[PDB]
Design a protein around this ligand. Structure first.
Ligand code: NA
Ligand code: NA
Ligand code: NA
Ligand code: NA
Ligand code: NA
Ligand code: NA
Ligand code: NA
Ligand code: NA
Ligand code: NA
Length: 320
């Protein structure tokens, strides 16, 4: 088994990289895409998904998704022409969605043929400030958060590839997961000081998937800049970043008083939970300039291992 770490590098400097970690040996290999291919990913490696032996790496500011063999790391294909891609969600072997920033459309692709095959137009959205981000599936529907300069979750009918509903919440929901009770969780970042769109106290929401209604809202503090909801494998413990790493049972009616991992005046930036053994990996960007570090914790918050990765490690992908 193994773990991929994407490193965004510094936006507009083309220093994104890919790392691979073997939890059995506690060994990391850095710059593995370069090592295998003899050229680099580009600018802002954002996310990665594995399906059927192929890893799909989204390079947000290089207009491309690379497909690699998960064992040799060699490029086996790519899809180009994306405005500014974010996340990939597969509906079948021949259809996936690829969300975008700076676009009002979600690209449809055929992963088998490496082609763009359609577009989904989002309502009340333009290229100048458009954003679609993470996706969860609920039956024939996909829910998607709209992050940058947006304040919505959209609901897409995957039969017709159409947006069929929307829910307005606090500004800039960052991320989206679905728990075992078919409740979605999203956490907003609250914008930023001087934003043209807004700056506010951010919130964590629990949203019923069936009825698309907010059930819980936990509001934090003005100045907080949270992100990155994540679930354990059984989808009953939620983790997120808000300075510290926090977690709580998805049945909770109150937020925790003690964090999983205390803030240490660095930059916790990426987060995953091993879906089989519950170990928690925290990617620390440190100061957004130096080489980042990943910290690996037991389910009880004891440090098992830590290892240097690339610059601004932001996402993980499990190879199971
Ligand atoms: Na980069
Ligand atoms: Na979009
Ligand atoms: Na935007
Ligand atoms: Na986006
Ligand atoms: Na907000
Ligand atoms: Na904020
Ligand atoms: Na800025
Ligand atoms: Na997530
Ligand atoms: Na990320």
């Amino acid at each position: 088994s193994g773990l991929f770490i994407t490193n965004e590098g510094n936006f507009q400097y083309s220093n994104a990289t890919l790392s691979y970690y073997d939890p059995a040996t506690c060994e990391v290999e850095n710059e593995v895409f370069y090592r295998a291919n003899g050229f680099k990913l580009g600018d802002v490696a954002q996310s990665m998904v594995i399906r059927d032996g192929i890893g799909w790496i989204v390079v947000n500011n290089s207009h491309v998704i690379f497909a690699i063999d998960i064992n040799t790391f060699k490029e086996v294909g790519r899809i180009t022409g994306f405005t500014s891609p974010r996340y990939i969600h597969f509906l079948s072997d021949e259809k996936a969605y690829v969300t975008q920033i700076w676009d009002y459309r979600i690209f449809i692709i055929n992963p088998k043929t490496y082609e763009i095959t359609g577009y989904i137009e989002c309502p009340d959205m333009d290229m100048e400030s458009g954003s679609t981000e993470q996706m969860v599936q609920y039956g024939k529907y996909v829910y998607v958060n709209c992050w940058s300069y947006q304040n919505r979750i959209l609901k897409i009918d995957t039969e017709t590839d159409k947006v069929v509903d929307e829910l307005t919440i606090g500004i800039q929901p960052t991320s989206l997961v679905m728990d075992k009770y078919n409740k979605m969780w999203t956490i907003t970042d609250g914008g930023y000081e001087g934003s043209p769109y807004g700056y506010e106290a951010p919130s964590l929401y629990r949203i019923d998937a069936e009825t698309f209604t907010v059930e819980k809202q936990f509001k934090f503090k003005l100045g907080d800049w949270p992100s990155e909801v994540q679930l354990n494998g059984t989808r009953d413990t939620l983790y997120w970043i808000n300075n510290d790493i926090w977690r709580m049972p998805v049945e909770a009616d109150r937020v925790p008083v003690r964090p999983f991992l205390e803030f240490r005046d660095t930059k916790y930036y990426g987060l995953t939970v091993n879906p089989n053994n519950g170990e928690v990996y925290v990617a620390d960007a440190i100061d957004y300039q130096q080489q980042g570090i990943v910290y690996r914790y037991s389910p009880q918050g004891k440090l098992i291992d830590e290892f240097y990765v690339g610059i601004i490690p932001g996402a993980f992908c499990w190879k199971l």
